[PDB]
Symmetry: D2
Subunit: 292 residues, 4 copies
Amino acid sequence: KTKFEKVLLIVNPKAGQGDLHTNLTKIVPPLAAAFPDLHILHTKEQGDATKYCQEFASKVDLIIVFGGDGTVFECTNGLAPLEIRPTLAIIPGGTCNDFSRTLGVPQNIAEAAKLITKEHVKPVDVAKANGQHFLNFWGIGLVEVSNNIDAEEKAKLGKIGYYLSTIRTVKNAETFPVKITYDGQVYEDEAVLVMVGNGEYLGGIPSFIPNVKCDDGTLDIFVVKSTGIQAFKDYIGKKLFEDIFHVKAKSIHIETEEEKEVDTDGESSLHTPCQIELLQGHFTMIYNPAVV
Amino acid sequence: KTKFEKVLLIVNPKAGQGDLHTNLTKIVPPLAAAFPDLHILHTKEQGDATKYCQEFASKVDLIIVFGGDGTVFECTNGLAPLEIRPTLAIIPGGTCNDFSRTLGVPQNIAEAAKLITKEHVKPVDVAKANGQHFLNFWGIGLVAEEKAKLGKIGYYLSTIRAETFPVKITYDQVYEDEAVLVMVGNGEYLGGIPSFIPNVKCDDGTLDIFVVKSTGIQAFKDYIGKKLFEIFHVKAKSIHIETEEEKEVDTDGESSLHTPCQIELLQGHFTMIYNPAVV
Amino acid sequence: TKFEKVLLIVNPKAGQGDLHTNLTKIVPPLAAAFPDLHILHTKEQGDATKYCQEFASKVDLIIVFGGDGTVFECTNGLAPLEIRPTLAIIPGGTCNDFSRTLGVPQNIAEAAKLITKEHVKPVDVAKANGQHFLNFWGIGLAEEKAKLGKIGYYLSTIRTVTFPVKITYDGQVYEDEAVLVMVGNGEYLGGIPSFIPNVKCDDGTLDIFVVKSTGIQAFKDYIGKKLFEIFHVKAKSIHIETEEEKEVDTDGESSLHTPCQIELLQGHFTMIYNPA
Amino acid sequence: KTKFEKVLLIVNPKAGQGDLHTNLTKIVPPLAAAFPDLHILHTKEQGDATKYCQEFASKVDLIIVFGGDGTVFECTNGLAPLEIRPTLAIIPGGTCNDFSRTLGVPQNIAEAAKLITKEHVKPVDVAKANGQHFLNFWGIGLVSNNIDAEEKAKLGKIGYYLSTIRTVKNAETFPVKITYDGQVYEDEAVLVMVGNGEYLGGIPSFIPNVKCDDGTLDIFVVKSTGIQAFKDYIGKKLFEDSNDIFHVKAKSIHIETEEEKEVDTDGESSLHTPCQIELLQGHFTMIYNPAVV
Ligand SMILES: [Mg+2]
Ligand SMILES: [Mg+2]
Ligand SMILES: [Mg+2]
Ligand SMILES: [Mg+2]
């Protein structure tokens, strides 16, 4: 009894603060004891994880990634476009690790590795925006680092985490027109933030978009109107994330007046306009049934 | 001197009218003689060619496909999303074989196979519409079994002798009108004959937008009749197309794309075997 | 089908070196029948051995297009391994002894077709001091020599052409002056049915055949007559000693010499054959 | 700046007394930190290590085996007959681990793993007897109670023989003929060995001055008249030449007995006499400890 005859572990050697030998002591032995056919590849350059996923997708039954949101995103882009997509698992090696939290994965990396040996798997929806896949979110209006301190915190927290840490003090925020068509309906207004969420955690903490699930077959649209800046600041302060326009939809189109740059799970070249679709149960992933 | 240390040949056994042994007699010996490491896989089901491309892309230097537009499209979708994409070649095994004609590939399959042994390669642009790739075309307004023989676009051309719709197109500017046909072309041949969209090249780094206005139905019918291919038509790299309702889109083969669409061009995305004598 | 994946090893010099024409004859029947077929050409001596060793765990059938020497490279490639896929021969030399043992037609298009019928049988492989063989082991054996092979050449000239030997075989002993000592596994030697009578490549024993020093003239006549029915016995475990080291001839190029311990590996290969 | 782009680690999960997780904690992290392409396969049955070697020999640049003399022998038989033979390394996971000691590999398994990361390699001769390869020895003339049987498994065949030879009462004598590089030895013997390893039975070779890379093999024969002197020789552990004990170096060897006698070697096998024995000079490249040599 195993679901996974062959396993690949992709290691970003800079993950877990870059203490490589110590990180491998924590994660490899549980996996090597449990999985009698285990291949371990370190990345060297940006894109390597994507390439490994595309090369090994037809060869292994499980791909485990040790890395932060960026490494996980490389795997998302590697596997999502393929016909054959093995189960994916995350050992959280950044500071944010949003999707791992969505899957209930303990942030202790030794514990994350042990969890994978339990082999609990569930289907997970993958979103697609103009042919660009994501697991956590799509957003405009999340855009300001003055210095290394700020830049180190921004890198540590992630784009969304950083935005949340500073939104309560962001004086005079940029407003913009937006048109959103969703399952035959329309929303048009002046906005300060537009999000489409798939992850149950954003910025390291439960999604500020209420009641997001990564496997319910719909996406969540969340818009902060130009008149709602203070109410959103207060809402973020209180951390009570119950239902500013917010609706669930499967097929979404978002237009702005000018082409605006889009933020998503990691580095990308998306901009508006965007057509956004959902691929239901597209990935199977290791998760923690006790917590999630 | 060889550019291709390892070669994969994907065979759709139903191609070339399905006379499998005879077709293999024509195509395999020239390839096996020229390429000392040659792997031959037959497809069995829809999607197999896509799977083979994705499994072998990191393993071989050349993938040859023996099949019609649909098999070629499966290879286009297999390879286009990947980081590593080996050279692709086509042995035309359907009735239309548009992109093979774009590459100057002789429709004689033995000759197409020999051509590959010459190893003439050129970059080819690949288009992408909302994450769906194509080599020949994207279109809306393209609407008896001769339909299967000719292909969607070939069939449309055979019968063009009424439905209008609103369309908005943003390109690099804006075009807004009532239309009967909207095309974005990348292939030099459509429906088995030279593109009715004038002066299309698959490697010039831009796409061609071609719109038949609601007032232009008769002029387009006459234009198609005359076969002088020289109505709004413009070249652009980044394109967005909106309709009033979600309209189904036709492309190189079977697909689920619909409007609205963002269309991009990936310059030189593929390298492909071609015939430099056809000029 | 018994063969999900197939490898075809091509020696491009086989079949007189008319490569394209030879591929027209052999590849289409195989490619039509086997939907996963990988074709590799050899370039240097030893390539066929390497290919067999690399692909033995990956494919279910290995077909070799080549003469006795190419077949011997495959024999040496596969025989020492734990996992040995079925082997088939398309005869691309002049002699092709083991192909004849298997009833393979010498017409290469017809040999290729036969493979598509997938008739398979176990075949014994012999081993002498760690050197494997399919046809023969022997002591006492230029354009014509290369065409016919060592054993074929010997037979073509024996009618116009001595040493001490001790042979222990399954606990018994033979000791005499000899002119030829053979151990046969193949049913054909030198392109014609084995001059060692009633050899079978799959009966679980080897055949020892010794021409005594006094038997030269009788052996010449025996070869002339080609009725193949001096010492001949069947045995499984064999040791052969001479007074000095003598060089040994076998299926192809090798560095064997006496003394030799010879063993039989029963059913060691499975091979494509012609049941008709 | 590495010699090994791809590495395979073969794990016998019963090695190191079978504490699998703890053993992997000791050996895998150093290797995984040093080798950015590392494939780890566990054996399940006898023969698996042989099969893994034969499958991966053309695919990887280094094969590391974690296991005892038997697992190492499976690798020896896997790789030795092949045309392409990657470098081999041993992490000692049995009790004896003779060849690892020949290579100066520390018996501490975490230290053995670290050593591999240093990438020190040397050529090693591999012997071949009637097509059966070996690294340590070939021998003829080599369990009273549960104690004996337990100690036999712990020590290995040659280690066990050495632990009990001082007790053996009326040992079987047998006739033997040995031809070696054109010369001959014929006598009644109680033990005949051909040695290639520098350690036998867990301690330095009782055959004097054996080297695994000097291009010759060592023949060592205890005559029927020399039983007592050999017992005393083993007792004293001074393994230098001195006289009813025949010892010579040779490259091409043939050994004949009156009847077919069963042969013992590095691990389980079906060899018997008569035997032709050859040496394949530099046949393997192997990881070693140049500090201990
Ligand atoms: Mg959802
Ligand atoms: Mg163009
Ligand atoms: Mg027989
Ligand atoms: Mg030595």
